[PDB]
Amino acid sequence: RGSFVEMVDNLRGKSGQGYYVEMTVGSPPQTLNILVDTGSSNFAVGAAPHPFLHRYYQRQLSSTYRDLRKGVYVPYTQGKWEGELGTDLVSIPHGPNVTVRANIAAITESDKFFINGSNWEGILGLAYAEIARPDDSLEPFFDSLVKQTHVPNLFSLQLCGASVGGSMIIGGIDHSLYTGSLWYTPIRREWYYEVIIVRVEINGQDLKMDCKEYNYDKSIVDSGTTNLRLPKKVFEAAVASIKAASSTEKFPDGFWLGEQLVCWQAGTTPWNIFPVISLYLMGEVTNQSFRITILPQQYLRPVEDVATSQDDCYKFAISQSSTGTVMGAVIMEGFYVVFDRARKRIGFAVSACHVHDEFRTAAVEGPFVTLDMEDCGYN
Numbered sequence: 577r578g579s580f581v582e583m584v585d586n587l588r589g590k591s592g593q594g595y596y597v598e599m600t601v602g603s604p605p606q607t608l609n610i611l612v613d614t615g616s617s618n619f620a621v622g623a624a625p626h627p628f629l630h631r632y633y634q635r636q637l638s639s640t641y642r643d644l645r646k647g648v649y650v651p652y653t654q655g656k657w658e659g660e661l662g663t664d665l666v667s668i669p670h671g672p673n674v675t676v677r678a679n680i681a682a683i684t685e686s687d688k689f690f691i692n693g694s695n696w697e698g699i700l701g702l703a704y705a706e707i708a709r710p711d712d713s714l715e716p717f718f719d720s721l722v723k724q725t726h727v728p729n730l731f732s733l734q735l736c737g738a739s740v741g742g743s744m745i746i747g748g749i750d751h752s753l754y755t756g757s758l759w760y761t762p763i764r765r766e767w768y769y770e771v772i773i774v775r776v777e778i779n780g781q782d783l784k785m786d787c788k789e790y791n792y793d794k795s796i797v798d799s800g801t802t803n804l805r806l807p808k809k810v811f812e813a814a815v816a817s818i819k820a821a822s823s824t825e826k827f828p829d830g831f832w833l834g835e836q837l838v839c840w841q842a843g844t845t846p847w848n849i850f851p852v853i854s855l856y857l858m859g860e861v862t863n864q865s866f867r868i869t870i871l872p873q874q875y876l877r878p879v880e881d882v883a884t885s886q887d888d889c890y891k892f893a894i895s896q897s898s899t900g901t902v903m904g905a906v907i908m909e910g911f912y913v914v915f916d917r918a919r920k921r922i923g924f925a926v927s928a929c930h931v932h933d934e935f936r937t938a939a940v941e942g943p944f945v946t947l948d949m950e951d952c953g954y955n
């Protein structure tokens with residue numbers, strides 16, 4: 577408990593392409609880089625020589641593979657993936673010293689799933705069975721891990737922005753990874769890591785919106801989304817408020833829509849003209865909340881690959897949604913986040929690694945008195 581040195585720094589990444597952990601599958605072990613994804617529930621890996629992939633799962637080479645004789649088809653916006661289900665033996669070299677028999681979806685065909693240039697080959701869905709494909713009877717990796725071992729039923733994530741890095745502590749917490757105290761918000765329902773936002777402030781100013789809007793039709797904590805994604809109505813109000821606070825300088829209207837980038841000479845990015853953003857989350861006690869506070873350092877994402885420019889180019893990392901609020905890396909990079917599955921709660925503390933300046937830092941503060949917090953959830 578409290579200290580897990582062999583798991584510190586076990587995550588890597590490229591900005592905008594998520595964080596991945598090294599895993600092994602089959603016997604003898606095949607090493608793969610696997611995206612850490614708290615927004616889905618399948619362990620799905622490349623299993624055929626797609627051209628974007630550094631490597632792939634070669635089932636024929638594993639003496640421990642078992643076929644489930646079941647296919648899986650997964651469509652989404654603009655694409656799909658398709659695979660074949662089985663089980664095999666899975667370890668995390670920089671995780672707990674255990675090996676488990678887990679469900680693996682061997683991906684045989686995909687469109688717009690893998691990234692050309694990225695260093696990962698599969699996805700570790702860490703969310704719940706309710707959203708597994710094809711159905712909730714396909715046991716997610718973490719459920720198998722807990723059933724089959726003595727690893728405690730929780731994991732925590734320290735994502736460090738910028739090639740990025742971080743830690744995934746499986747089965748516990750490392751106190752060196754955060755400062756101050758952890759504050760907990762209940763997991764509203766075990767499908768996504770669903771939470772309830774009860775209040776939103778920009779630079780200290782309440783958006784004074786019916787709090788149901790903040791959670792229309794859900795809010796989730798998702799390591800596999802880059803951005804903070806806000807429902808349309810909340811996003812409109814959020815930028816309107818952000819536009820106002822930052823009107824000391826002007827930017828194209830398309831910038832706030834993430835349709836163009838914005839650039840400053842190096843060393844000369846004006847952080848101070850930008851407002852802090854505070855989300856108040858439902859607390860553990862009736863009528864009690866806490867708030868988490870992020871900086872422009874979190875919501876203005878560094879974009880390296882621009883041949884049209886030669887400066888500090890940033891994308892605005894806040895965007896509309898029709899699927900609800902999504903607290904992606906933008907949020908998580910500010911905090912140490914504890915996915916306390918045993919107690920159905922998510923903990924937040926200031927991350928010991930988060931990017932800030934000398935004037936402002938990310939914050940986790942409470943308690944606050946907030947009434948009618950149950951009304952904030954959408955049915």
Ligand SMILES: Cc1cc([C@@]2(c3cccc(-c4cncc(Cl)c4)c3)COC(N)=N2)ccc1OC(F)F
Nearest residue numbers: 592593594615616618650652689709799800801802
């Ligand atoms: C349909 C589907 C989507 C996902 C998804 C995902 C897929 C592929 C790439 C990225 C990604 C790309 N670039 C930066 C990042 Cl940070 C992530 C994210 C979409 O949303 C989340 N959270 N993960 C995961 C598994 C799924 O399979 C099914 F089993 F549900």
Ligand code: NA
Nearest residue numbers: 722723725726
């Ligand atoms: Na167990």
Ligand code: NA
Nearest residue numbers: 751752754755
């Ligand atoms: Na600490």
